[PDB]
Symmetry: C4
């Protein structure tokens, strides 16, 4: 073994991230304005725009969830607050019309009671929200929700970064699988635990387990540019979840911060000291970006451009596009 | 598949850019001063110097086109202006003697009328100027021009970054194929759409489709140093198109800008907000470089040095040179 | 041979360091709080926490050794001081209860007398401390100690970076093998001598020689984050030795230094000019980190997180985890 | 072909530089102080220290040549001065005892007359000094010198970066071959001409042509640290030529320059505008380093350390050492 030892499987794969690849152009009869950007969030739920906002307390509360749904995507309400307040935020979103909304739950002692309160409030999607879903407690939670409320509510499980973990969630009854261990902009899992998987390889592996069973993959974490959304979907994901890219918008929680003459908003990991009060997230800031509607317009515009370049009339066609791998000289 | 999934073709190639390679020296009887730098711009048109200026409104109007032709190359007049004005710039170049000139046209509603006005003004080369030529509308335009005015005017099509796209332009009747999707210094296609192809690999692939049919390849975008011109031609291109390297010259459009005691000129993508008024270009500045004649002298001097090192008496011999691939430690 | 010459063995391997890999998550029934972090320091000695402090005069004297043992690890007392003083530091550690302690010896003229004084003071572990243990003088020292005092004292040999060197120490009777040639944060062996081995590959190779004989490997040098400890153990090491990560703690030797409003402590290589008075170490500073107990808590917390993600109930299970190799885009 | 086109030989090799590799330690009975650092400069001339100073007007005139010879190496006098003055510098070196000295000549009109004046002055080594020796004019010069004065004077030819070029110089009668196209610290050949070869691969290839014929290789350019000297020799070179590493010494030409409170000396390429008055070198400065004797002591000290780590008793044994290739994470 050229990298050491006598076991070829010790280093099991070469992991690629978004910056390691570009989409290859292909023959196209598709104009960006004419592409169809709709895609499955879950087995049953299709979004007009393949984007969902992160379940984070500096990204998604009712205002963001309402704005995301109006824009054609969806928000996932964070769970760092009392059950009653989270359920009230679901109701608030529903007071603004026939808008889709999701909400995060954990696997702890109060997670089931949280899920039932969200159900009663009319939530459309429950996201079982963990850093590592390949665990009997997480799989049991997904299965029990699906068996209990799965006729009326779609159940998402995550996060995973391997084929086997994705397969386990599929077996448990997940209506979608969320992919990303380590890639988030505010994440320190890779430095604290030394654990992770580069996101393009993680998506390719998860899709190999999920697509044969008709289960969509949500690419969660590490997206920095609109072009990364196109790369995530071309790797086989059906939607992308965004934290950093949406945290600086008017509709996110938090106030404006002025630093050296420039405007910022606070953005922090849910595993940061601040959010919890051994952290696996940090607390920082991102530039202020203005209204959500305008950010989504630019992100979808980039996606539409990719669809034009690759000849993809639909997201399902984009999922079949090819990559070229690039070097550091990039 | 070591990088993920079960499909070896998902990542279709490893893309190299200029900074990934160096030309290997070889046995030489060639002195730099004695090398022949002439090369085909198109099937019928040979230039004394294998360089053409970009069709950009901060690079090529009549002054630059005149200077480029006098230097042994050619300019391609930009099309971000009324048809009458572009045709008048062609006439202005012709008032300065028997000088070659090209001009860009699009594929939109007024593109045909633009092409005919340029024809009437005495243009030598029409460049069908798109970000992605592998499209029936672009191919049809190339073919219709070739069939209509192709006895008197050479028709260039672009841009492409793949073998199949190059082959399609050849089939459509292109007299030259222009290569470059994503590599321009002011380009944001790779970050906005996530689409592109590293330029050495793009040229190698395009040449594999074009050279067997006797169609020259124009390497367009990403050239930063004179040595990059030699690399582009050794990869098989017949000429190089330059934007950034020529934008800071006296002959480019625009005035001098003084910033922190240094001199600059404005340089912007034609897909930038400023040029258009979802942008795929930015607006910036490059250092002021003085007269065009002096810049071309240094660029051709570097090319001549490469020809001496590689034993290439002609550009056709340089196209057969070999590379060594280098690492980040470079 | 693609990299030059006609001998494929001239470049014998591709060396990976900590930053080249990540641990892959795997199926887990392990909660971080419930993982067992104990591991063999030597054949006979098991630590509660798999961490030992470097034998350096800016890291380990009696205060650090006492604190490390109380925290569940061990200190190795440095040998840059008179024999009588080093032996007195061993006695000081013993005055604080039933605490494990190690101490470094060289192979020079006074090394044997040093070892016997340490023996008489009640040392538990003797570390034969060299930059390159694959040498008859070092191997003889290890063997002679083992034959003379090996019933009452565990004998560690190092350092090595190759399989053959590790095998030689095992043959000589080493109770543990310490791995690391070149990777230390204050080390200049790689720039001065041009010699070294990236630490993940060095550990994989040393473990291939040591594990079949039941001899634990101590990963020494280059660890910068808690996640690196998990990577070192997953590569097959049984403990990690830390210098930089512990040098800024209250318990290390040296006073606080104030620079530009921030607090630091001095940290220097034992091969630096300062320590010796052709240096192979430098003298610098690291941020002040507060009490040792708190640093160890965060480091072990990260290790525990890795054990949870990889489904490792014990360190022996963690040694079987798998990696993904990452690119520069990381 | 994964990198483009249909020709696997277009990219002929993967080129490694010094920073791409480390020397592997091996079993050693060698103490640094006891290693033998002597090595062949040419077929007939053996140096005590395997180092020669560059033929540059900011590195080697008589003072440096005298100091280098006294230190056990040799200087090569630059040729950017009248023939009479260069010959007088040779005589000056000879007035200081039985000291070896070399001198550069070109291949131009006055090169033969220069060589004969140097011969008459008692030069020991003539270096045919070109950027690309694979050329009939350079090969003819080497052969004619060897046939004319080769009984009394050793004739070095260079520079080369390929096996075939090295073989040609050997055939022409070279007593040593100097390797390096593009790697010099002040060199811009790689950016101006786009031509070069990473130096470890260049040495491995040149040695494959030279060693079978008993012709030593001089590694010239790109050495930044003492460890690079050990790497160059382990790749198979017999000596190293140094420019940058010696330009800041007291014995180099030029005065002290004070910039922002620090001391520097001027260092410039012989192909820079300043030296010539299309440049392939730049003009800059390097830190002042003090006496040559002290710099050589540190460089040889690093070499001696490498010999100890690799178990190399002699330079011929070091030439058989092995490498590990490292990544960017290095
Ligand atoms: O504290 C944390 N540590 C690690 N990952 C986090 C943390 N908080 C949120 N995440 C994940 O990071 C994603 C956002 O990543 P981003 O879009 O790159 O900023 C979220 O959707 C989570 O999956
Ligand atoms: O706005 C833009 N976005 C992307 N590419 C552009 C844009 N404008 C011009 N280009 C291309 O960039 C080339 C110049 O690249 P440069 O020489 O690297 O600056 C031009 O010849 C075009 O092919
Ligand atoms: O001067 C030196 N040069 C090279 N390595 C050293 C020196 N001093 C200590 N070391 C080694 O560096 C280790 C600490 O590495 P660190 O934890 O990366 O700072 C120590 O345990 C030694 O193995
Ligand atoms: O102007 C120049 N351009 C390119 N190489 C040069 C020039 N002048 C000297 N050299 C070479 O650079 C070597 C010194 O490289 P250095 O030790 O890396 O600074 C010299 O021995 C020459 O072989
Ligand atoms: C550290 C942790 N354990 N369980 C949760 C929930 C968290 S978190 O608050 O920090 N959020 C996430 C979410 C997704 C992640 C992917 N990698 N790391 C992640 C962390
Ligand atoms: C975004 C776009 N679509 N069509 C055009 C024309 C443009 S442009 O104005 O921005 N010019 C170019 C030209 C070449 C390119 C290669 N990659 N991207 C490019 C952009
Ligand atoms: C240069 C030297 N020779 N012998 C010793 C002891 C030293 S040291 O003081 O500098 N310590 C170490 C320890 C471990 C090392 C791994 N690589 N280099 C190292 C240096
Ligand atoms: C550009 C040139 N042609 N001939 C000479 C002599 C020169 S130089 O003055 O610039 N010196 C060197 C010497 C070695 C080199 C390796 N690569 N480039 C080099 C340049």
């Amino acid at each position: 073994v050229p990298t050491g030892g006598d076991d070829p499987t010790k280093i099991a794969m070469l992991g690629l991230t978004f910056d390691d690849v570009l989409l290859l152009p292909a023959a196209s009869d598709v104009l960006p304005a004419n592409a169809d950007t709709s895609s499955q969030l879950t087995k049953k739920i299709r979004l007009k725009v393949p984007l969902v906002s992160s379940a984070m307390d500096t990204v998604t509360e009712a205002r963001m969830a309402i704005a995301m749904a109006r824009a054609g995507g969806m928000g996932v309400l964070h769970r760092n607050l009392p059950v009653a307040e989270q359920a009230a935020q679901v109701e608030t979103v529903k007071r603004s019309g026939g808008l889709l909304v999701g909400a995060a739950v954990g696997v702890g002692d109060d997670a089931w009671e949280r899920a039932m309160a969200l159900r009663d409030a009319g939530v459309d999607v429950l996201v079982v929200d963990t850093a590592h879903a390949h665990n009997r407690k997480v799989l049991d939670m997904v299965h029990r929700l699906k068996t209990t409320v799965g006729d009326e509510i779609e159940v998402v499980g995550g996060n995973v970064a391997t084929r086997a973990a994705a397969a386990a969630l599929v077996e448990a009854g997940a209506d979608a699988v969320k992919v990303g261990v380590g890639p988030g902009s505010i994440c320190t899992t890779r430095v604290v635990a030394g654990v992770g998987a580069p996101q393009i390889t993680a998506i390719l592996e998860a899709v190999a387990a999920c697509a044969p069973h008709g289960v969509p993959v949500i690419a969660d974490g590490g997206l920095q540019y609109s072009g990364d959304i196109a790369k995530a979907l071309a790797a086989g994901a059906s939607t992308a979840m965004l934290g950093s890219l949406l945290a600086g918008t008017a509709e996110s929680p938090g106030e404006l911060i002025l630093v050296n003459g420039k405007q910022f908003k606070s953005y922090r990991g849910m595993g940061s000291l601040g959010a919890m009060q051994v952290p696996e997230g940090i607390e920082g800031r991102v530039p202020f970006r203005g209204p959500l509607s305008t950010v989504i317009h630019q992100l979808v515009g980039g996606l539409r451009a990719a669809m034009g370049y690759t000849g993809s009339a639909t997201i399902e066609e984009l999922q079949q596009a090819q990559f070229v791998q690039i070097t550091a000289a990039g």
